[PDB]
Enzyme design. Structure first.
Site, mmCIF file in Angstrom:
data_model
loop_
_atom_site.group_PDB
_atom_site.id
_atom_site.type_symbol
_atom_site.label_atom_id
_atom_site.label_comp_id
_atom_site.label_asym_id
_atom_site.label_seq_id
_atom_site.Cartn_x
_atom_site.Cartn_y
_atom_site.Cartn_z
ATOM 1 N N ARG A 96 0.836 -1.197 0.000
ATOM 2 C CA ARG A 96 0.000 0.000 0.000
ATOM 3 C C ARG A 96 0.869 1.243 0.000
ATOM 4 O O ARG A 96 1.658 1.462 0.921
ATOM 5 C CB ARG A 96 -0.944 0.033 1.221
ATOM 6 C CG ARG A 96 -1.840 1.294 1.301
ATOM 7 C CD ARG A 96 -3.088 1.087 2.165
ATOM 8 N NE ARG A 96 -3.052 1.863 3.398
ATOM 9 C CZ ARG A 96 -3.362 3.154 3.500
ATOM 10 N NH1 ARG A 96 -3.747 3.841 2.443
ATOM 11 N NH2 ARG A 96 -3.268 3.767 4.671
ATOM 12 N N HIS B 112 -2.968 11.147 0.363
ATOM 13 C CA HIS B 112 -2.390 10.870 1.674
ATOM 14 C C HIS B 112 -1.802 12.169 2.233
ATOM 15 O O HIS B 112 -0.617 12.243 2.546
ATOM 16 C CB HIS B 112 -1.302 9.784 1.588
ATOM 17 C CG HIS B 112 -1.258 8.861 2.775
ATOM 18 N ND1 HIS B 112 -1.044 9.303 4.065
ATOM 19 C CD2 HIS B 112 -1.382 7.512 2.858
ATOM 20 C CE1 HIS B 112 -1.038 8.269 4.891
ATOM 21 N NE2 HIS B 112 -1.240 7.171 4.183
ATOM 22 N N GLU C 195 -7.562 8.776 5.990
ATOM 23 C CA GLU C 195 -7.831 9.516 7.225
ATOM 24 C C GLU C 195 -8.296 10.977 7.061
ATOM 25 O O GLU C 195 -7.598 11.917 7.444
ATOM 26 C CB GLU C 195 -6.588 9.457 8.131
ATOM 27 C CG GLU C 195 -6.238 8.036 8.574
ATOM 28 C CD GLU C 195 -5.105 7.970 9.586
ATOM 29 O OE1 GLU C 195 -4.672 9.033 10.075
ATOM 30 O OE2 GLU C 195 -4.655 6.847 9.906
ATOM 31 N N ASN D 204 -7.860 1.620 9.617
ATOM 32 C CA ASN D 204 -6.605 2.008 10.262
ATOM 33 C C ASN D 204 -6.828 2.022 11.781
ATOM 34 O O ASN D 204 -7.742 2.707 12.268
ATOM 35 C CB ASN D 204 -6.183 3.409 9.817
ATOM 36 C CG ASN D 204 -5.526 3.419 8.459
ATOM 37 O OD1 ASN D 204 -5.596 2.438 7.721
ATOM 38 N ND2 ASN D 204 -4.885 4.536 8.114
ATOM 39 N N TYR E 131 -4.573 1.985 15.677
ATOM 40 C CA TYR E 131 -3.334 2.110 16.428
ATOM 41 C C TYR E 131 -3.613 2.001 17.922
ATOM 42 O O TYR E 131 -2.991 1.210 18.637
ATOM 43 C CB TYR E 131 -2.693 3.467 16.142
ATOM 44 C CG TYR E 131 -2.032 3.573 14.789
ATOM 45 C CD1 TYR E 131 -0.754 3.052 14.575
ATOM 46 C CD2 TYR E 131 -2.675 4.192 13.727
ATOM 47 C CE1 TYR E 131 -0.135 3.149 13.334
ATOM 48 C CE2 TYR E 131 -2.067 4.298 12.482
ATOM 49 C CZ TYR E 131 -0.796 3.776 12.291
ATOM 50 O OH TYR E 131 -0.183 3.898 11.064
ATOM 51 N N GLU F 130 -3.606 -0.290 7.950
ATOM 52 C CA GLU F 130 -2.556 0.322 8.776
ATOM 53 C C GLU F 130 -2.625 -0.129 10.237
ATOM 54 O O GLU F 130 -3.650 0.025 10.891
ATOM 55 C CB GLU F 130 -2.668 1.848 8.761
ATOM 56 C CG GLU F 130 -1.865 2.588 7.713
ATOM 57 C CD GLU F 130 -1.971 4.102 7.881
ATOM 58 O OE1 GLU F 130 -1.728 4.593 9.005
ATOM 59 O OE2 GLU F 130 -2.296 4.806 6.902
#
Length: 426
Positions: free
Chosen positions: A71, A115, A160, A278, A280, A334
Site C-alpha cells: 500500500r 495521503h 484519514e 486504520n 493504532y 494500517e
C-alpha cells in the site's frame, strides 16, 4: 475473498524525498515544515527515505518479506504541480514504473490517491475549505486512473479525512495548520465531496476495486455521554456519510457554516468495494468545555513511544462492530507501533516490544475474522522508518530501521517475525 492479503504500507511524502526533483510542485506539508514549531525535530520530507531513487531496493525488501500487497500513495503535486491543469509526465512516469516493478515482483499494488499532500497551489485558493478543490481531486483521480488502472486493482480515495480536517484545520498540528472550527467542518465536507466525485471518476476509468481509508479509535470513559460524543467524532463522523446514513449527531456544539444539500449526501454515499481500516490505539475521555464537550485523559495501560495505549482487544471489537455496520469487505490498511529503536552497527535491530505489539494485533484481527468478519488483509504500518509528520524522524514505525544519514536499511526483529508469520499463515 480468496487468498488473505498480507502487506506493508507507506505514503509518498513520508518516504519519497526528491522534494523538488523532476518538476514536483510544493505541497501544504512542504510549507508547514518551514514553520518553526511545526515539526518536533525541525526536519522536513527531504530527503526522507529517498524512496524516489531506491524504490527497487525497497521492492526487493518486500520480496524477501513475502508480502503479497504494497500500500502506497501517489503524490498529487507530482502529477499536477499546481494541483490542477498542467500535468507533469515525469510524475506519472515514476509511478507507472513503480507499478511495473511491483507486478514483476508478484506484489499487488494498493494505491492511495490522497495521503495529505495537497498541492500548495490549491491551498492558496482555499485548500479543502473550497469545493473547487473537490473538483480538482476528481480530475487528479481520473488522470491517475487512466494511467494505472490497467495494472492497479486497488484504489483508495482518501486516507484519514479526520486528520486532514481537524488535525490540519482545527488543532492546527497538521498541514496547512489553521485553527478554526469552521474551516475544519468545511474541510470535512469538501473532503467527503472529493471522495464521492473521485469514486465516479475512478469507476469511469476502469478501476477494478474502489474504497477509502479511515482511522478509528474505540472511546472509553466513565460518563457514557462524553464517551458517545467521542465515538461519533472519531469513528462515525466519516463512516456514516459514506455508508449512506448521513452524518451522525454532530459531536460538536457548534452549527456548521452552511447547509448540506440532499443531492450531496447521495453523491457522497457512492457504493464501495472495500473499507480501509486504520487502527493504532483507543481513546480515554471525560466531559469538558469547548466546541467538543470532551477532554482526553492520559493512557491507562502500557504505551508505545507515542504514548498511545496499546490495546489489541480494541482492534478485535472494532472489526466485529464494523462487520455488521459495513456492507463491504474490510482490510486493516494500517497497524503499527513506534518504539525507541537503537542501532549501532548490528545486522538486526532487536524489536521485542514492536514484535509483541504486531503479533497481538494480528492474533486479535484473525480472531475477529474467525468469528465472521469479512477481513481480507492486514498491512503493517510502514515497511521502513520514515517522516512521522509532526514528530519528524523522532518516531520510528518501520519493520526495517533506516539510518537516514546513510539511507541504509536494516532489518529489525519485527521484519524477521513478519516473514515467518506470513509463510505459516499459508
Amino acid at each position: 475473498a480468496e487468498k488473505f492479503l498480507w502487506g506493508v504500507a507507506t505514503s509518498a511524502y513520508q518516504i519519497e524525498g526528491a522534494t523538488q526533483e523532476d518538476g514536483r510542485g510544493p505541497s501544504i506539508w512542504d510549507t508547514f515544515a518551514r514553520r518553526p514549531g511545526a515539526i518536533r525535530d525541525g526536519s522536513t520530507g527531504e530527503p526522507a527515505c529517498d524512496h524516489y531513487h531506491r524504490y527497487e531496493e525497497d521492492i526487493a525488501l518486500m520480496q524477501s518479506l513475502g508480502v503479497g500487497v504494497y500500500r502506497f500513495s501517489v503524490a498529487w503535486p507530482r502529477i499536477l504541480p499546481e494541483g490542477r491543469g498542467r500535468i507533469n509526465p515525469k510524475g506519472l512516469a515514476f509511478y507507472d514504473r513503480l507499478v511495473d516493478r511491483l507486478l514483476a515482483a508478484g506484489i499487488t499494488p494498493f494505491l492511495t490517491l490522497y495521503h495529505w499532500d495537497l498541492p500548495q497551489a490549491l491551498e492558496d485558493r482555499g485548500g479543502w475549505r473550497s469545493r473547487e478543490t473537490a473538483f480538482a481531486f476528481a480530475e487528479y483521480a481520473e488522470a491517475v486512473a487512466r494511467a494505472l488502472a490497467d495494472r492497479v486493482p486497488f484504489f483508495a480515495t482518501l486516507n484519514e479525512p479526520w486528520c486532514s480536517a481537524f488535525l490540519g484545520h482545527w488543532t492546527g498540528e497538521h498541514a496547512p495548520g489553521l485553527r478554526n472550527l469552521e474551516a475544519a467542518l468545511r474541510a470535512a465536507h469538501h473532503l467527503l465531496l472529493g471522495h464521492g466525485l473521485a469514486v465516479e471518476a475512478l469507476r469511469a476509468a476502469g478501476a477494478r476495486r474502489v474504497g477509502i481509508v479511515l482511522n478509528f479509535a474505540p472511546a472509553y470513559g466513565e460518563d457514557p455521554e462524553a464517551v458517545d460524543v467521542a465515538d461519533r467524532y472519531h469513528n462515525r463522523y466519516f463512516l456514516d456519510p459514506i455508508l449512506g446514513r448521513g452524518y451522525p449527531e454532530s459531536p460538536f456544539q457548534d452549527p456548521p457554516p452552511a447547509p448540506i444539500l440532499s443531492r450531496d449526501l447521495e453523491a457522497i454515499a457512492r457504493p464501495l468495494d472495500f473499507l480501509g481500516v486504520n487502527y493504532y490505539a483507543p481513546v480515554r475521555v471525560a466531559p469538558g468545555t469547548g466546541p467538543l464537550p470532551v477532554r482526553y485523559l492520559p493512557p491507562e495501560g502500557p504505551v508505545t513511544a507515542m504514548g498511545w495505549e496499546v490495546y489489541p482487544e480494541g482492534l478485535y471489537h472494532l472489526l466485529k462492530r464494523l462487520g455488521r455496520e459495513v456492507p463491504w469487505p474490510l482490510y486493516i490498511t494500517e497497524n503499527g507501533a513506534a518504539y525507541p529503536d537503537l542501532w549501532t552497527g548490528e545486522a538486526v535491530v532487536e524489536d521485542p516490544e514492536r514484535v509483541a505489539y504486531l503479533e497481538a494485533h494480528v492474533e486479535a484481527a484473525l480472531r475477529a475474522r474467525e468469528e465472521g468478519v469479512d477481513l481480507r488483509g492486514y498491512f503493517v504500518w510502514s515497511l521502513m522508518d520514515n517522516f512521522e509528520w509532526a514528530f519528524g524522524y523522532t518516531r520510528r514505525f518501520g519493520l526495517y530501521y533506516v539510518d537516514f544519514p546513510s539511507q541504509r536499511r536494516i532489518p529489525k526483529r519485527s521484519a524477521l517475525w513478519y516473514r515467518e508469520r506470513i509463510a505459516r499463515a499459508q
